[PDB]
GROMACS .gro file of N, CA, C and O in nm:
model
  360
    1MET      N    1  -2.758   3.634  -4.961
    1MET     CA    2  -2.601   3.565  -4.903
    1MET      C    3  -2.550   3.512  -5.041
    1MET      O    4  -2.435   3.564  -5.103
    2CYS      N    5  -2.607   3.409  -5.137
    2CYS     CA    6  -2.530   3.370  -5.213
    2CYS      C    7  -2.546   3.458  -5.355
    2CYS      O    8  -2.613   3.543  -5.347
    3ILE      N    9  -2.467   3.416  -5.434
    3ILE     CA   10  -2.468   3.510  -5.585
    3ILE      C   11  -2.410   3.396  -5.689
    3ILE      O   12  -2.362   3.305  -5.648
    4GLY      N   13  -2.463   3.450  -5.822
    4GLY     CA   14  -2.412   3.347  -5.941
    4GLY      C   15  -2.446   3.433  -6.032
    4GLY      O   16  -2.573   3.383  -6.108
    5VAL      N   17  -2.423   3.517  -6.075
    5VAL     CA   18  -2.463   3.643  -6.176
    5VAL      C   19  -2.319   3.705  -6.263
    5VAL      O   20  -2.247   3.754  -6.159
    6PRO      N   21  -2.338   3.724  -6.389
    6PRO     CA   22  -2.245   3.837  -6.444
    6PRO      C   23  -2.228   3.972  -6.398
    6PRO      O   24  -2.316   4.027  -6.338
    7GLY      N   25  -2.099   4.018  -6.408
    7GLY     CA   26  -2.086   4.163  -6.401
    7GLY      C   27  -1.958   4.199  -6.451
    7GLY      O   28  -1.877   4.135  -6.501
    8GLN      N   29  -1.971   4.364  -6.409
    8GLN     CA   30  -1.830   4.463  -6.497
    8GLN      C   31  -1.746   4.474  -6.376
    8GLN      O   32  -1.806   4.515  -6.309
    9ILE      N   33  -1.614   4.410  -6.401
    9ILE     CA   34  -1.509   4.464  -6.325
    9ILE      C   35  -1.488   4.614  -6.264
    9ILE      O   36  -1.427   4.671  -6.417
   10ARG      N   37  -1.574   4.697  -6.256
   10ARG     CA   38  -1.614   4.847  -6.230
   10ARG      C   39  -1.504   4.930  -6.190
   10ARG      O   40  -1.493   5.037  -6.229
   11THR      N   41  -1.443   4.850  -6.077
   11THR     CA   42  -1.344   4.901  -6.044
   11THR      C   43  -1.259   4.774  -5.933
   11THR      O   44  -1.324   4.702  -5.908
   12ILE      N   45  -1.147   4.831  -5.901
   12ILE     CA   46  -1.023   4.732  -5.846
   12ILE      C   47  -0.982   4.801  -5.748
   12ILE      O   48  -0.947   4.946  -5.747
   13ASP      N   49  -0.968   4.718  -5.614
   13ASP     CA   50  -0.898   4.815  -5.507
   13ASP      C   51  -0.762   4.745  -5.463
   13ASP      O   52  -0.682   4.778  -5.402
   14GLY      N   53  -0.742   4.635  -5.506
   14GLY     CA   54  -0.645   4.538  -5.489
   14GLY      C   55  -0.683   4.373  -5.527
   14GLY      O   56  -0.685   4.361  -5.652
   15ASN      N   57  -0.628   4.273  -5.442
   15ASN     CA   58  -0.703   4.139  -5.438
   15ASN      C   59  -0.855   4.149  -5.460
   15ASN      O   60  -0.938   4.068  -5.564
   16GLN      N   61  -0.916   4.270  -5.385
   16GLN     CA   62  -1.061   4.290  -5.397
   16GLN      C   63  -1.114   4.368  -5.511
   16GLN      O   64  -1.028   4.464  -5.537
   17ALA      N   65  -1.236   4.350  -5.604
   17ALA     CA   66  -1.220   4.444  -5.679
   17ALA      C   67  -1.448   4.457  -5.642
   17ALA      O   68  -1.480   4.423  -5.565
   18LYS      N   69  -1.455   4.567  -5.738
   18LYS     CA   70  -1.640   4.629  -5.713
   18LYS      C   71  -1.704   4.578  -5.817
   18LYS      O   72  -1.692   4.684  -5.908
   19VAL      N   73  -1.707   4.490  -5.841
   19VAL     CA   74  -1.809   4.431  -5.956
   19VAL      C   75  -1.900   4.517  -5.958
   19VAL      O   76  -1.963   4.510  -5.894
   20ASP      N   77  -1.956   4.548  -6.068
   20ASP     CA   78  -2.118   4.600  -6.088
   20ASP      C   79  -2.165   4.459  -6.157
   20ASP      O   80  -2.160   4.454  -6.248
   21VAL      N   81  -2.282   4.444  -6.055
   21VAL     CA   82  -2.360   4.293  -6.065
   21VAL      C   83  -2.476   4.351  -6.148
   21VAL      O   84  -2.597   4.340  -6.086
   22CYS      N   85  -2.475   4.448  -6.275
   22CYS     CA   86  -2.574   4.512  -6.340
   22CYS      C   87  -2.654   4.586  -6.294
   22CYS      O   88  -2.800   4.597  -6.286
   23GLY      N   89  -2.656   4.672  -6.172
   23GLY     CA   90  -2.747   4.742  -6.079
   23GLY      C   91  -2.657   4.808  -5.975
   23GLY      O   92  -2.652   4.911  -5.946
   24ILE      N   93  -2.578   4.756  -5.909
   24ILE     CA   94  -2.496   4.790  -5.767
   24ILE      C   95  -2.362   4.712  -5.765
   24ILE      O   96  -2.362   4.611  -5.823
   25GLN      N   97  -2.265   4.773  -5.713
   25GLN     CA   98  -2.132   4.742  -5.713
   25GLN      C   99  -2.142   4.648  -5.593
   25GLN      O  100  -2.164   4.653  -5.505
   26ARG      N  101  -2.062   4.497  -5.588
   26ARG     CA  102  -2.022   4.411  -5.479
   26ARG      C  103  -1.894   4.378  -5.477
   26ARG      O  104  -1.813   4.392  -5.572
   27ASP      N  105  -1.852   4.379  -5.372
   27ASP     CA  106  -1.717   4.339  -5.337
   27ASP      C  107  -1.678   4.199  -5.371
   27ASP      O  108  -1.757   4.102  -5.324
   28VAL      N  109  -1.605   4.172  -5.452
   28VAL     CA  110  -1.565   4.038  -5.496
   28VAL      C  111  -1.433   4.013  -5.524
   28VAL      O  112  -1.329   4.104  -5.562
   29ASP      N  113  -1.368   3.879  -5.452
   29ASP     CA  114  -1.250   3.835  -5.460
   29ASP      C  115  -1.167   3.804  -5.575
   29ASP      O  116  -1.251   3.717  -5.631
   30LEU      N  117  -1.074   3.834  -5.647
   30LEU     CA  118  -1.004   3.797  -5.753
   30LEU      C  119  -0.912   3.731  -5.772
   30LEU      O  120  -0.895   3.690  -5.874
   31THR      N  121  -0.880   3.638  -5.679
   31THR     CA  122  -0.792   3.544  -5.667
   31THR      C  123  -0.786   3.442  -5.738
   31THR      O  124  -0.666   3.366  -5.825
   32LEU      N  125  -0.901   3.409  -5.811
   32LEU     CA  126  -0.906   3.276  -5.905
   32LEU      C  127  -0.855   3.336  -6.044
   32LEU      O  128  -0.855   3.256  -6.151
   33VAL      N  129  -0.860   3.425  -6.083
   33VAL     CA  130  -0.858   3.506  -6.205
   33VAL      C  131  -0.722   3.607  -6.189
   33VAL      O  132  -0.654   3.666  -6.309
   34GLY      N  133  -0.693   3.648  -6.121
   34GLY     CA  134  -0.610   3.781  -6.090
   34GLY      C  135  -0.656   3.920  -6.059
   34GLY      O  136  -0.729   3.916  -6.185
   35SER      N  137  -0.590   4.038  -6.037
   35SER     CA  138  -0.674   4.168  -6.043
   35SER      C  139  -0.627   4.196  -6.201
   35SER      O  140  -0.652   4.295  -6.242
   36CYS      N  141  -0.531   4.154  -6.241
   36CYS     CA  142  -0.432   4.197  -6.395
   36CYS      C  143  -0.455   4.105  -6.480
   36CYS      O  144  -0.444   3.965  -6.461
   37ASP      N  145  -0.471   4.149  -6.631
   37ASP     CA  146  -0.442   4.021  -6.727
   37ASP      C  147  -0.296   3.991  -6.756
   37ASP      O  148  -0.208   4.046  -6.697
   38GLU      N  149  -0.276   3.874  -6.812
   38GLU     CA  150  -0.149   3.844  -6.849
   38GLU      C  151  -0.046   3.951  -6.888
   38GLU      O  152   0.066   3.955  -6.869
   39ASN      N  153  -0.097   4.037  -6.950
   39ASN     CA  154   0.048   4.161  -7.013
   39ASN      C  155   0.052   4.293  -6.857
   39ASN      O  156   0.072   4.385  -6.924
   40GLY      N  157  -0.019   4.247  -6.773
   40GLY     CA  158  -0.026   4.333  -6.636
   40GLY      C  159  -0.121   4.441  -6.655
   40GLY      O  160  -0.121   4.540  -6.565
   41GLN      N  161  -0.219   4.433  -6.759
   41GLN     CA  162  -0.332   4.543  -6.730
   41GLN      C  163  -0.413   4.537  -6.661
   41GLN      O  164  -0.454   4.402  -6.675
   42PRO      N  165  -0.453   4.642  -6.568
   42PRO     CA  166  -0.573   4.635  -6.457
   42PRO      C  167  -0.698   4.559  -6.542
   42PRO      O  168  -0.730   4.616  -6.676
   43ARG      N  169  -0.781   4.454  -6.478
   43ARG     CA  170  -0.895   4.425  -6.537
   43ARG      C  171  -1.027   4.521  -6.558
   43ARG      O  172  -1.142   4.455  -6.593
   44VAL      N  173  -1.001   4.655  -6.515
   44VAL     CA  174  -1.101   4.742  -6.509
   44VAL      C  175  -1.178   4.728  -6.628
   44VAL      O  176  -1.120   4.749  -6.766
   45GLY      N  177  -1.306   4.714  -6.651
   45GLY     CA  178  -1.396   4.718  -6.777
   45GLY      C  179  -1.415   4.570  -6.851
   45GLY      O  180  -1.494   4.562  -6.912
   46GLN      N  181  -1.346   4.486  -6.789
   46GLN     CA  182  -1.374   4.325  -6.826
   46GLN      C  183  -1.452   4.302  -6.735
   46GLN      O  184  -1.549   4.351  -6.657
   47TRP      N  185  -1.528   4.175  -6.795
   47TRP     CA  186  -1.650   4.098  -6.682
   47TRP      C  187  -1.620   3.995  -6.647
   47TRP      O  188  -1.521   3.911  -6.672
   48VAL      N  189  -1.704   3.952  -6.557
   48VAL     CA  190  -1.682   3.829  -6.471
   48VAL      C  191  -1.802   3.765  -6.417
   48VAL      O  192  -1.919   3.830  -6.371
   49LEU      N  193  -1.785   3.634  -6.402
   49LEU     CA  194  -1.937   3.546  -6.321
   49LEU      C  195  -1.858   3.570  -6.159
   49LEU      O  196  -1.776   3.502  -6.135
   50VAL      N  197  -1.964   3.641  -6.111
   50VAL     CA  198  -1.940   3.646  -5.966
   50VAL      C  199  -2.034   3.513  -5.914
   50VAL      O  200  -2.143   3.517  -5.926
   51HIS      N  201  -1.951   3.464  -5.852
   51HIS     CA  202  -2.010   3.326  -5.758
   51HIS      C  203  -1.982   3.308  -5.618
   51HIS      O  204  -1.854   3.330  -5.595
   52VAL      N  205  -2.045   3.351  -5.520
   52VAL     CA  206  -2.019   3.288  -5.406
   52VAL      C  207  -1.943   3.402  -5.328
   52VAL      O  208  -1.845   3.403  -5.231
   53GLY      N  209  -1.914   3.524  -5.387
   53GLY     CA  210  -1.842   3.637  -5.313
   53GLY      C  211  -1.697   3.647  -5.414
   53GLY      O  212  -1.589   3.716  -5.414
   54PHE      N  213  -1.667   3.554  -5.529
   54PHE     CA  214  -1.543   3.544  -5.591
   54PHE      C  215  -1.550   3.505  -5.746
   54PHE      O  216  -1.693   3.509  -5.794
   55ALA      N  217  -1.443   3.589  -5.806
   55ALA     CA  218  -1.456   3.567  -5.965
   55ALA      C  219  -1.418   3.429  -5.995
   55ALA      O  220  -1.365   3.378  -5.980
   56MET      N  221  -1.581   3.372  -6.035
   56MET     CA  222  -1.569   3.195  -6.141
   56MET      C  223  -1.512   3.213  -6.232
   56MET      O  224  -1.412   3.112  -6.245
   57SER      N  225  -1.505   3.296  -6.318
   57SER     CA  226  -1.439   3.298  -6.466
   57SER      C  227  -1.460   3.430  -6.504
   57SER      O  228  -1.546   3.530  -6.487
   58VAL      N  229  -1.327   3.499  -6.546
   58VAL     CA  230  -1.382   3.622  -6.617
   58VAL      C  231  -1.376   3.606  -6.752
   58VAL      O  232  -1.375   3.488  -6.835
   59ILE      N  233  -1.445   3.668  -6.813
   59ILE     CA  234  -1.523   3.663  -6.937
   59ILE      C  235  -1.566   3.803  -7.042
   59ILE      O  236  -1.510   3.880  -6.971
   60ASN      N  237  -1.577   3.788  -7.180
   60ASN     CA  238  -1.551   3.868  -7.264
   60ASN      C  239  -1.715   3.951  -7.230
   60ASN      O  240  -1.786   3.904  -7.169
   61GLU      N  241  -1.744   4.068  -7.298
   61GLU     CA  242  -1.863   4.124  -7.261
   61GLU      C  243  -1.935   4.061  -7.349
   61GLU      O  244  -2.103   4.077  -7.305
   62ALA      N  245  -1.962   4.001  -7.460
   62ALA     CA  246  -2.007   3.921  -7.558
   62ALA      C  247  -2.097   3.783  -7.477
   62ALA      O  248  -2.192   3.778  -7.448
   63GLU      N  249  -1.971   3.741  -7.384
   63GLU     CA  250  -2.033   3.614  -7.303
   63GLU      C  251  -2.128   3.669  -7.185
   63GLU      O  252  -2.236   3.578  -7.129
   64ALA      N  253  -2.090   3.772  -7.122
   64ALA     CA  254  -2.176   3.837  -7.012
   64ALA      C  255  -2.293   3.890  -7.046
   64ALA      O  256  -2.401   3.815  -6.998
   65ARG      N  257  -2.286   3.930  -7.182
   65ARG     CA  258  -2.422   3.988  -7.236
   65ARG      C  259  -2.520   3.891  -7.239
   65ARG      O  260  -2.615   3.893  -7.243
   66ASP      N  261  -2.465   3.798  -7.318
   66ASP     CA  262  -2.548   3.690  -7.359
   66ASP      C  263  -2.593   3.601  -7.239
   66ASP      O  264  -2.697   3.531  -7.249
   67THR      N  265  -2.489   3.554  -7.130
   67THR     CA  266  -2.533   3.515  -7.011
   67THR      C  267  -2.632   3.603  -6.921
   67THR      O  268  -2.747   3.500  -6.887
   68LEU      N  269  -2.639   3.697  -6.940
   68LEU     CA  270  -2.715   3.808  -6.880
   68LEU      C  271  -2.860   3.786  -6.936
   68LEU      O  272  -2.958   3.770  -6.874
   69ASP      N  273  -2.879   3.779  -7.033
   69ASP     CA  274  -3.030   3.767  -7.150
   69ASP      C  275  -3.047   3.629  -7.150
   69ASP      O  276  -3.180   3.623  -7.114
   70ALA      N  277  -2.983   3.526  -7.082
   70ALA     CA  278  -3.037   3.418  -7.068
   70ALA      C  279  -3.061   3.411  -6.948
   70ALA      O  280  -3.204   3.386  -6.896
   71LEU      N  281  -2.996   3.433  -6.820
   71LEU     CA  282  -3.027   3.478  -6.719
   71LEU      C  283  -3.174   3.532  -6.654
   71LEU      O  284  -3.248   3.511  -6.552
   72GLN      N  285  -3.176   3.635  -6.746
   72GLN     CA  286  -3.294   3.731  -6.695
   72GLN      C  287  -3.426   3.671  -6.746
   72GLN      O  288  -3.532   3.712  -6.719
   73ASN      N  289  -3.436   3.582  -6.841
   73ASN     CA  290  -3.522   3.550  -6.951
   73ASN      C  291  -3.638   3.509  -6.825
   73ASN      O  292  -3.802   3.526  -6.875
   74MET      N  293  -3.632   3.449  -6.740
   74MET     CA  294  -3.723   3.370  -6.581
   74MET      C  295  -3.801   3.517  -6.558
   74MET      O  296  -3.879   3.430  -6.522
   75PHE      N  297  -3.748   3.608  -6.544
   75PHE     CA  298  -3.842   3.736  -6.483
   75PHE      C  299  -3.845   3.859  -6.546
   75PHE      O  300  -3.932   3.926  -6.543
   76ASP      N  301  -3.763   3.876  -6.662
   76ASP     CA  302  -3.783   3.995  -6.738
   76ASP      C  303  -3.948   3.982  -6.823
   76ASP      O  304  -3.965   4.077  -6.851
   77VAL      N  305  -3.991   3.883  -6.816
   77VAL     CA  306  -4.093   3.844  -6.884
   77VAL      C  307  -4.224   3.917  -6.808
   77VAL      O  308  -4.367   3.962  -6.826
   78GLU      N  309  -4.205   3.960  -6.684
   78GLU     CA  310  -4.304   4.041  -6.580
   78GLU      C  311  -4.241   4.164  -6.537
   78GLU      O  312  -4.113   4.161  -6.557
   79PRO      N  313  -4.286   4.265  -6.486
   79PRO     CA  314  -4.251   4.372  -6.413
   79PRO      C  315  -4.216   4.358  -6.274
   79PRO      O  316  -4.150   4.455  -6.273
   80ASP      N  317  -4.177   4.258  -6.246
   80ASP     CA  318  -4.122   4.190  -6.112
   80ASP      C  319  -3.960   4.217  -6.154
   80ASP      O  320  -3.917   4.265  -6.074
   81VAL      N  321  -3.900   4.205  -6.241
   81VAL     CA  322  -3.790   4.276  -6.293
   81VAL      C  323  -3.760   4.419  -6.243
   81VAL      O  324  -3.653   4.460  -6.198
   82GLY      N  325  -3.864   4.494  -6.243
   82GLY     CA  326  -3.851   4.658  -6.194
   82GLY      C  327  -3.827   4.650  -6.067
   82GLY      O  328  -3.771   4.729  -6.005
   83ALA      N  329  -3.939   4.599  -5.981
   83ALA     CA  330  -3.973   4.576  -5.831
   83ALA      C  331  -3.806   4.532  -5.766
   83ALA      O  332  -3.733   4.553  -5.701
   84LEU      N  333  -3.790   4.421  -5.849
   84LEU     CA  334  -3.609   4.375  -5.833
   84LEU      C  335  -3.495   4.490  -5.850
   84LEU      O  336  -3.448   4.522  -5.740
   85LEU      N  337  -3.478   4.547  -5.929
   85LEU     CA  338  -3.398   4.577  -5.978
   85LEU      C  339  -3.414   4.742  -5.895
   85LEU      O  340  -3.293   4.758  -5.830
   86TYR      N  341  -3.546   4.840  -5.909
   86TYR     CA  342  -3.503   4.946  -5.813
   86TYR      C  343  -3.515   4.884  -5.652
   86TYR      O  344  -3.572   4.975  -5.541
   87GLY      N  345  -3.533   4.760  -5.620
   87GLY     CA  346  -3.592   4.758  -5.500
   87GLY      C  347  -3.412   4.737  -5.406
   87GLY      O  348  -3.339   4.725  -5.435
   88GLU      N  349  -3.460   4.685  -5.265
   88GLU     CA  350  -3.323   4.671  -5.167
   88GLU      C  351  -3.343   4.489  -5.129
   88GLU      O  352  -3.272   4.485  -5.021
   89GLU      N  353  -3.406   4.407  -5.223
   89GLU     CA  354  -3.423   4.243  -5.184
   89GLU      C  355  -3.268   4.203  -5.206
   89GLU      O  356  -3.273   4.075  -5.233
   90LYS      N  357  -3.206   4.275  -5.252
   90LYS     CA  358  -3.066   4.241  -5.350
   90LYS      C  359  -2.932   4.340  -5.264
   90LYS      O  360  -2.978   4.424  -5.202
   0.00000   0.00000   0.00000
């Protein structure tokens, strides 16, 4: 149900987008950031903090990567990371 993880805006459909949360795409509402950049460029390839099904903040690749490295640290230390990643518990 809940979510609070970085991902890449890997595809866009309208106000909704299909953010790859580093393993599978989730439908995410972009109202808080807009589906396009200020210059009208579609946000495809940009990164975003997904929280409760909304774009909490749009972020750069480096910010997402740093956040993911911190976030995974609690469980990447064990093979449980693989059981999660290749499982259906998410």
